[model samples]
Target: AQSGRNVNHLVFANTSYEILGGGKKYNQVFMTMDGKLKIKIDYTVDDSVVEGDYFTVDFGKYIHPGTSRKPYRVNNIHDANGRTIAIGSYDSATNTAKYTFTNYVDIYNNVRGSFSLLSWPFKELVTTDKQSVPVGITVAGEDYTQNVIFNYGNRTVPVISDINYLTKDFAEFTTYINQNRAFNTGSKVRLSGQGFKFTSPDEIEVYKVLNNSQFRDSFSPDYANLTQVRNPKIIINSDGSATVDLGDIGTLGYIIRSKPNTLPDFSGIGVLKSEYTFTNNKNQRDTRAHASSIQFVRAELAGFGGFGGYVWFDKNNDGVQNDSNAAAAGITVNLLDPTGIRLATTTTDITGHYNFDNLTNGNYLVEFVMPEGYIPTQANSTVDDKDSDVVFENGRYIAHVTIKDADNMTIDAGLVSD
Candidate 1:
C-alpha cells in the first residue's frame, strides 16, 4: 500500500493520520482528522544531515491576527515512540516554516520538589518531579504544610541542600519557641520593648533591659544597672532584643551635662570701652518671647502702645541718629497714665538711655523734663526730634507711647547746648 517517488496522494489513508490533497508540490501536507496542525516539507539535501542542514516545512496558518485562538490548544507533539518532539521553523518567506527536530524539548507543566534530612546537622535530600510537592515546617509545636509547584529540568537525582532544614538555626523558629517558653498565658510581646541609654558623646553609664507594659520613660526609667559598657559589642537576639556586652569601663573625665551647661564668665571689674569687646563661648546667649494666640490677636487688632527712640544731641539738626552724635544723659523721664497720673519715673543713665518696665497695657504720655541751661533743638527735622512731641511752653518733650506686656526701650529726646 506504499507508493514510491515521495508518496504523494489524493485522499490517502493510514492508521494514525490521513492526507486529503497531497502531491510532491511545493506544499504537501498530511494530518489526522482531528489534527488542528499540519506539516509539509519543501526540501532536504540529504538524510545524512550535517550541522548547517536546512529544510523548509509549513505549519498552515497558526497566527490569527485581530482574533484570539485561546479555545484551541496544542498539548504536545509526540514522535513514533511517544516521546515529545520540538517544532519550529518560523520564518515567513514562503508561507512554509522549516525544522529539524533533534534538540532538547521544553515541557511546560507543573513541577514539584521536596526537602528531607540526610545527615545529622548538614545534609538534605532535595527531590523534584512533575508533580505537586509538600513543604513542612513547625513553629511552637504547630505543624504547617504548604503545597507548591517547582520546576525541574535535566536533573535525575535528589540534590543535597538545606543545612538547617528543621533546626533552631533559623531565627524565626527560635524566636517562636522563645516566646512560647518565656511568656505566661494572657501576656504578649510589648510594642516598644527595648531601651538604650547613651551619653552626650559615645560614652555609657549602665545597661538595663525593661518592658514597656510595666514601666517606660524616655529619661529616667525604672531599671537596675546590669554592667558598664564601653565601645560595647552588640548582638541582636532572635526575639528582637540586643545582647549588649559591657566588657570594660573607663574613668570619666567631667561627665557631659544632661542639661544645659553653664556659659563661660566675662564678669569683670574694668570699664568696658570698645563696642565689639565682649567675650563668649558656645551655648552662652539665648532668648524667646511667649504670647497666647488670643493675646497676640488682641495686641495686633488694637495696636498696643510702644515707645522707643534715641536720646542724643542732634548737632546738625538732621533727624537721623548717627554714631557720631553724642548721647545726652541725666534727663528726667516720667511715664504718665492715660489720665495724666504719673505711674513711674526714671532718669537717663550714663548712655542717655532710659526705659520704664512693667507698665499697664495702654496709652502713656512720656514726659521728659529738659535740663537746665539747655534748649531742646527744633525737634531736629528728619532726625531724633521728629519722633518726640515737643512742648514749646515747657522744656518737656512728651512722647505718646502705647504700652503692652512687651516693653519699649527707645523713647529718646535730643537737646543742643543752650
Candidate 2:
C-alpha cells in the first residue's frame, strides 16, 4: 500500500488465506506437497507491542530488518518445550527478513510474538498446477513482493479426521461450539473437519504443533508456522461432511498471553495446535478420489458459555409445558449482568429445571421472581418446548439472553396459579 503495492489478495477460489499488513498480520506462508517454502511472521520488537497483538497494522514502511545485513540467518521457531519462541533471517540486502522473539519476551516483558522464515530455494513440481513464491516483506520502509501462492488446484489436500467445535451461533446463540472440542479462545467457531472432499478442493491448515501426538501424523502441521484457513463456506455435501465458517476464530486466535482474549492457552503444554485435512472428491462433477489423513492438534482461547430453561406448570392456560400442570417447586432465578447487576441465583426443582452454568461472553438478564402464587403465562406458543418466556418488560419477568461461544438451553418459563 501507499505505493508498495502487490496486495493481490486472491480470488480464484482462494487457495489458503490470512495475509495482510500490520507487523505483517501474524504472517503465514505455506507450501510443501514436498518442495518446501514455509514462512511465519508476527514481528514486533515492542513499541508497547503493536497490532495482531495490540491492534494497529497499517504497515506503511516496513522496517524491522534488525540483523542489518550480510545474509543474516537464525530463522528459529521452536515451541514444543525447547522454547526459542521465534528467530529470523533473510536480507537480500533488505528484501526484508529480520526478527527476534524470545519466549514471548520471557512471558510478557516485551518483544512481540510469532517468528519463522524457513529454508527457501524450492522447485520440484510434479504435474505443476501452480508454484511461485516471491514472499518478501517490509512496511514502514517500503519493500513489498507478495506472490506466495500454494497448490490446491491439484486438489486433494482436505483431510481433518474428526473435529466438531461449533459456534458463531450454532443454529444461531450460539450454543453449538463444543457443540465439542476442549480448550477455548476468542470462540465463535464452526469447523466440522470430517475427511472432507465432496469431489476435490479443501483447505484447513491451522498450525504450530512442535512435538507431540507424533506430530499428529503430519500434513503441513507447522510448516513455516501454518494458518491456511480456506473455509469461506464451501458446498457439495452428501456424505463428504462439511461445516467450516471459523471466521478467524472470532478473530483467528492462537496468540496466547493476553492482548486480545488470548488462545492456544499456552498456559504451558496442552496438545499445542495442529489439525490436518485431505480429500479425494465425491463430487459427480470434479473427478473425485485421492484421500489423505491424520491431523488433530491443540491450543487456543476464549472460554465460558452456558444457558438453560424450564419452569413448567401451565394448566389449560396453555402457555405450554403441560404435564396436566404441577411441577413448580421453588422458582426464583436471577442472573443479570448487562447493567442490571446480580450475576447468579437459581431455583426450580421438581421437574422445573433452572440451570445457568459458567458464563463469560456477555449480555444476559434472565430475571424471574414470580412464585408467590404464580400467574404469568401467555407469550408466544405453538412450541418452543411448550412456550412462555416470561415477558412483562417495563417491570419484571425479563429473559434477554446472549452467552455466545455457545449455550442457550431454551430459557423456558411459564406458570399460572394466580
Candidate 3:
C-alpha cells in the first residue's frame, strides 16, 4: 500500500464523521497520486442518517510553493439533469468539488464546497524561527475527575481553534490524515496537545479537524464531521461504568449531568487520569496564542437549523423590523459562547433565513449585533445586552425582538491610539 511518494510528504484531504448512539461513523480518505497530488473522493450515503453523517468540510487544498494559482481541478462534475458543467476548480490556490447533481438532489437541493487553501513560499527554513520547539499541551489539576494542563489554564472552552498551522505537513493533503504522520506524529507512541479534562461523571468525545477556523453549525452532506469532542470522564453506575455524553456543543454541558448544569468548572477540572501522553513531535507547540478551546459535558445534543427572529424588508425608514416595513437583509448574525466573545460571523441568505451547519450542541449566546440604524426589539434584548440575552442549547430559539432605527453606535475601547 506504500506509494513512491516522499516519506517526508504525502498530501491528504481527510474527512471524519460522528454517529450518535445508534449509527456508524467512518473516516473517509482521499490521497494524492499525480505529482500535483490530486486526491480522489467518492461517497455513499446510508438510507438512515445519523448525528454526524453530513459533517463534511474542506481541510482546503494544499500545494507546493510557487505553483500557479490554478492548483486544483475537478474532473467529472455535472448539473442536476446530469449535464456537465464547470463543477470544481484547478485555481492556483486550491482544488475543490461540489456534490454530483444526484447527491445534491438527495440533500440540500444543491451541493457546493466550503473549503479553501493558500500557497505560501517557504520564505525561510530551518530552526531560526524556533520551528523545532517541542510544543506540548499541559493537563494539570486535582484528582478524582477533571484535569487542566498548564497552571491555571484549565477550563476547556467548547471550541479549540487555530493550533497553528505547520506548512511542513499535509496538503496538498486534506482530511484528518495528520500530515505529520510518518516522521513526526507516527514516530511517537503518544500524541500530546494542550487542553483540560475532567472526571466528575463527565464524558467527552475528541475530534481531529483538518479544516481551520471555518466553523460549522451542524453535520450535513456538505462536509464530513470529524470525531466527537471527547469527554474522558466516565459516569459510574450501580455495577460498573458507562461513557456519559452531556450533549453536543451549543447545548449547555451543565444540563447533561444527572444533577443538571453543575459539576467541575473548567478551572477545576484538570487532566484525566492516564488519559493522554505524547505521540507526535510536532505537538509540543503552544496552542494558547493560536487557539481557543471549549468543553461540552452533560449536555443535550443540539440539532440542526434552529434559529429564528422577526424579519422585515428595508421598507419605511426606521431600522426596527417593526419600524421599517421594508424588507431588510436577514438579521445580522454572530455566534458566541455563554460569555460574549465573537466566534463565527455570517448573514442570513436572501431568503431572510439563516442556518448554521455542523455545530456541537452546547450553551451559546445568539446576538444580533444591532445593525447600524437599528436596535434589537425588546424580545431579543437582554435585561441588559450585557447580561440576560437568550441562551440556546441543542434546540432552537425564536426571539421576538422589536427592531428600531437608530444612529450606528461604535465603541472605542481606547486600547488603541489614533
What root-mean-square deviation over C-alphas does model 3 reach?
23.1
Over 4 Å off in model 1, which ranges? 1-309, 323-325, 383-396
| Candidate 2 C-alpha lDDT tens digits along 310-355 | 8777877867776654667678877654444444567877777878
Better of 2 and 3 by TM-score: 2
Across residues 1-418, which tens digit of lDDT does each residue of candidate 3 receive? 0011111111122222121111112121111101111222223333333211222212232222222111222333333443322112223333222222222323432233322222221211211211121111110110111111111111233221111111111101011212222112211011111222222343223344444321221110122344443453345433222234222222212211111122222222111111111233444521211122222221221121233332344233222233333333545665444333333445655654444433323344455544455532223232222222332333422122221111121110000011
lDDT per model vs. reference: 0.30, 0.39, 0.25
Estimate the Cα RMSD of every predicted model relative to the unseen true structure. Answer: 41.0, 21.4, 23.1
Please identify model 2 stretches exceeding 4 Å from their true place.
1-37, 42-128, 136-289, 292-418
What TM-score, to 2 decimals, does candidate 1 have?
A: 0.27
Worst ten-residue run, lDDT, model 2?
Answer: 170-179
* Number of the predicted model whose TM-score against the real structure is largest: 1
